[PDB]
Design a protein around this ligand. Structure first.
Ligand SMILES: [Cl-]
Length: 217
């Protein structure tokens, strides 16, 4: 029997991966120095940290090696639920190796993860899986809302958490967030969502080039 990839997704080109990685790092630096973030630090960490400055680049140390990616379907070589159905789809086979542009609308941080929110085109949405275990933070969010690029994770967090963290952030702002920004960073408006959750809504969306394919460990 033929096994499947570990996961399907869009793998950023080297240059797009470097552009987004650098924007993520700049965000972490700017956020950690922002007055609003600093005065909410005890909502973010929970230990015996001193009354000194947290460097978010250190905090989010488990950064992807190599290129960045946006996962569609985690397959675990066929062991994940829904893997075989996903992979057999015409659209997946037709798209395999195709180039796409991914639109990044926002960067976000929680105490667990840092990531970029991806807003998929209608063509890209056809590659989004139709799975069976709906996260409660996805209630009243449209399919494909979880799409993201992981930028870093805290030490004991697994990268999958980044999509759950995005969904939870999106739940906070689903009714609209006009007038609610706590402040601004150079590239957009900064939102403080409580419980260590922060979102930079980009003034101008970023656009990265990627290729749809399957990754094998
Ligand atoms: Cl979703």
């Amino acid at each position: 029997k033929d096994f499947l990839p570990l996961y399907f997704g869009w793998f950023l080109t080297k240059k797009s991966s470097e552009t987004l990685r650098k924007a993520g790092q700049v965000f972490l630096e700017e956020l950690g120095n922002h007055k609003a973030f600093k005065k909410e630090l005890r909502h973010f960490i929970s230990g015996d940290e001193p009354k000194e400055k947290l460097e978010l680049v250190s905090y989010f140390g488990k950064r992807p090696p190599g290129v960045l990616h946006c996962t569609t379907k985690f397959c675990d070589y066929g062991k994940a639920a829904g893997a075989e159905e996903y992979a057999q789809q015409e659209v997946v086979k037709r798209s395999y190796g195709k180039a796409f542009k991914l639109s990044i609308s926002a960067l976000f941080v929680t105490p667990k993860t840092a990531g970029a929110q991806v807003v998929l085109t209608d063509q890209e949405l056809q590659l989004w899986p139709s799975d069976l275990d709906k996260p409660s933070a996805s209630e009243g969010l449209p399919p494909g809302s979880r799409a993201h690029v992981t930028l870093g994770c805290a030490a004991d967090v697994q990268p999958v958490q980044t999509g759950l963290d995005l969904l939870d952030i999106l739940q906070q702002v689903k009714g609209g967030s006009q007038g609610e920004a706590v402040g601004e960073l150079p590239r957009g408006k900064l939102y403080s969502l409580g419980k260590g959750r922060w979102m930079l809504s980009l003034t101008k969306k970023m656009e990265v080039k990627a290729i749809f394919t399957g990754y094998y460990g």
